[PDB]
Ligand SMILES: O=C(Nc1cccc(-c2n[nH]c3ccc(-c4nc[nH]n4)cc23)c1)c1ccco1
């Protein structure tokens with residue numbers, strides 16, 4: 290096969306000749322490109338020095354294996370993968386070709402969405418997350434910027450797993466389970482409705498303060514699950530009663546141009562109140578969220594789980610190279 | 616003070632506040648008129664109990680209706696406004712008039728209309744809510760049909776009565792009846808016992824009729840009712856049939872075998888109401904397939920039907936639950952009923 294090179298935004302992209310007129314859409318570094326075999330625009334991602342250490346190679350091998358095996362309507366589709374190198378010995382760069390979307394969620398936060406659209410977006414998020422959970426993948430890094438949409442309101446998750454969306458248990462260095470991703474969904478949901486970040490901490494420790502001021506000091510039952518030294522910190526914070534959810538998310542920030550909006554507003558606030566819960570023992574699960582009145586309107590009763598670690602940098606390199614070549 | 620009026624070949628004697636009586640409903644146990652209430656400035660429904668004191672069953676049922684109507688307070692159960700007797704003493708005592716909120720129609724009247732998914736699911740949500748409130752008070756209706764459900768033009772729906780006492784026996788399909796009983800649950804028809812989801816069969820029959828615009832199981836007589844069930848849903852399991860009373864068991868097992876019709880064929884796409892309607896249609900059919908189940912062991916519960924995608928969209932988590940209600944010789948009944956009236 291033949292390639293050509295183009296300097297794009299401080300970088301040099303060397304790609305198959307089928308991908309033309311590259312233009313940057315984010316930062317792996319990502320370009321939009323016209324595919325002259327398919328006749329469509331695609332997204333071309335050049336992986337950022339994939340084998341510089343232990344972390345990078347581990348991450349990039351995972352991303353590539355998962356993109357190839359996972360097929361769900363709410364997870365980004367891989368269209369092609371290539372390298373401009375011809376041997377394992379000179380092998381340096383990996384290019385991922387993915388479907389091109391219209392926008393990420395940061396951009397939709399700035400608009401005035403009705404209940405139908407908000408609930409449909411949230412339904413899709415939870416569907417994507419459920420599929421990831423069923424494959425043993427707990428994401429932990431969900432945020433507006435790694436979720437993309439089409440103008441017909443289709444939603445896909447970009448990666449397989451920033452401070453503003455981290456669950457209380459992550460902040461306090463506890464363990465976590467599936468519903469760690471529900472906290473993040475609650476944070477994104479709140480922001481879609483409010484137009485601003487719910488918990489905007491100046492640092493990772495100030496994050497806890499932002500949570501406490503709004504939701505209140507968590508229960509003694511929750512405290513019991515902390516190691517004494519971590520609990521000492523938590524209990525030495527000023528005490529907060531928490532703000533009522535009717536006050537946190539007042540009627541006026543919700544759509545209110547018809548009478549049927551009134552009940553959807555009660556439902557949306559109720560779901561928020563179950564997702565934004567400090568104690569993961571008491572926080573809603575993905576399956577229950579999917580059955581919530583606000584969400585379940587989108588469920589159709591009429592997808593197979595995917596057919597799915599420490600190494601030397603050279604051992605990782607041959608693993609990645611094998612994945613690119615088949 | 617009272618005055619008398621001849622209404623649809625019956626004589627009503629009512630308080631003078633109740634004026635311009637016009638009949639709206641007939642039948643045994645009660646004759647019903649709309650009346651303008653000059654104290655309240657609204658039209659109401661006046662029901663005269665159809666001879667409450669003829670025997671012990673009549674007096675029992677009349678007492679039960681009155682007690683329950685008084686104690687129950689739920690937005691989907693008919694509200695009682697007043698109760699009175701034209702007689703002045705316990706010795707005189709004879710007639711009972713019940714005054715209730717006036718609605719716009721019986722569900723018989725609005726069933727078969729061209730209704731969208733939004734109105735249909737809303738009516739069904741309301742029915743389920745009333746039923747659940749009854750169940751939580753220990754009341755299982757067992758005889759729900761469109762004629763005991765009433766509606767307003769805004770789609771508000773209420774249940775009109777409390778059906779059969781918990782300890783009442785029913786007659787199975789082999790024992791004749793004159794009237795139509797299109798909504799009777801298979802377990803009642805077959806002589807079985809009943810549990811709470813007896814009422815779910817009725818809702819399924821009502822849901823199907825709202826969608827199709829025709830009675831789902833329209834038997835020519837009491838026995839043909841069962842043939843209409845099996846022709847569409849299919850013969851139930853050997854195990855289920857084997858557990859029936861001999862009279863029933865022998866008939867039912869020697870019936871021709873039917874495979875049943877797929878719910879996509881029974882309730883096809885074109886009978887349902889955009890692209891938003893497509894998922895709702897699919898959800899509606901799914902609920903129907905779970906309600907219209909012969910064997911009560913395999914039939915959906917009221918709680919589960921309320922959480923269904925088709926239904927739960929009308930659930931408001933913020934609104935307060937309605938608190939649960941605070942619950943003989945024919946001449947002892949009279950004194951019991953008189954005290955309730957006064
Ligand atoms: O900006 C446009 N689209 C847009 C906007 C935001 C994301 C994507 C996007 N689609 N597919 C992807 C795969 C990966 C990434 C990725 N971003 C960081 N890292 N990776 C991003 C995408 C696309 C646009 C479309 C038409 C006219 O302008």
Ligand SMILES: O=C(Nc1cccc(-c2n[nH]c3ccc(-c4nc[nH]n4)cc23)c1)c1ccco1
Nearest residue numbers: 639640645647660715716717718719720721765
């Ligand atoms: O026909 C009208 N309304 C209507 C129609 C059918 C039922 C009711 C009804 N409202 N309240 C009730 C209480 C009991 C009964 C009852 N029927 C048997 N037994 N009991 C019935 C009702 C009302 C109407 C309203 C305005 C103009 O026409």
